[PDB]
Amino acid sequence: MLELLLLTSELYPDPVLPALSLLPHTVRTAPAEASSLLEAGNADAVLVDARNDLSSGRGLCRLLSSTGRSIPVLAVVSEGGLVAVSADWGLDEILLLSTGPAEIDARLRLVVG
Amino acid sequence: MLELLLLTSELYPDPVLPALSLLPHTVRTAPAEASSLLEAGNADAVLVDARNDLSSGRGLCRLLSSTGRSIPVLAVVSEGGLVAVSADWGLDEILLLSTGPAEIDARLRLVVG
Predict the structure, then answer these.
(1) In Å, how far is B5's CA from the nearest CA of chain A?
(2) Cα–Cα distance measured from residue B94 to residue B5, given in angstroms and rounded to the nearest whole number
(3) Contact A1, A27 (CB under 8 A)
(4) B58 near B82, Cβ under 8 Å?
(5) Looking at residue A65, which CATH number applies to its domain?
(6) For chain A, the helix, strand and coil percentages under 3-state DSSP, each to the nearest 5
């Protein structure tokens, strides 16, 4: 069903959200820059890889958010990064890198519909 | 810091969300019935125990998110009930029973202000 644009420096989606492969959603990766948004095409959501660099991660999410009208922004963080996540990120949903497939599916459904 | 209302048929909150006790928030329990709505009072959020009875769980959530009610509604669900969770529940957040303290805290913060 869903197309996901994952913004990361990884070059494979698997280190970012390992469980995502188990789901039928399609994932394209792009560098963690604001210009990658151009590459968002028909994507249903954008995931921002914020596992390691929280400052840039939060910066991206802020830039990505709102404007119009707008497509959902998700941040993927590690457990130690949860304290840094707050409303000023402009997030629609947050995900832990260890989140299981069922939980990934549920949060994606709820954030898109 | 937060006052939480947990709607559950359990005697204690710990079987529902074991990690919650590790946080400083205070938790009041009430039966998983419609009359418990009268007890919401000044809680900052209401958690509905939907680990075992999903139907009454969602019925409860729909009532909590009804006409003149502002308090954020959270459902606590098991991993194999995530699939039943959808927009018609009127949820502001979901939690898995196995969710850790750092994630509970982050989702409670994000859901309130």
Answers:
(1) 23
(2) 15
(3) no
(4) no
(5) 3.40.50.2300
(6) 35, 20, 45
Q: How far is B101 from chain A (nearest CA, A)?
A: 10
Domain ranges, residue A28: 1-113
The CA–CA distances, whole Å, from A81 to A51, A100, B26 equal: 7, 18, 24
Half-sphere exposure at residue B104, Cβ-oriented, CA atoms within 13 angstroms: 22
Q: How many CB pairs under 8 A join A and B?
A: 45
Nearest residue on chain B to A85, alpha-carbon basis: B106
Experimental approach was X-ray
* 3 state SS of B50: strand
Euclidean distance between CA atoms A50 and A37, whole angstroms:
16
Among candidates A85, A100, A110 on the partner chain, residue whose Cβ is nearest the Cβ of B79: A100
A85, A103, A110 ranked by CB distance to B106: nearest: A85
Specified resolution (Å): 2.8
CA distance B83 to chain A (A): 7
Q: Could you identify the residue written with the tokens 């698997």?
A: A14
Tally of structural domains, chain B: 1
3-state secondary structure at position B46:
strand
CA-nearest residue to A82 within chain B is: B106
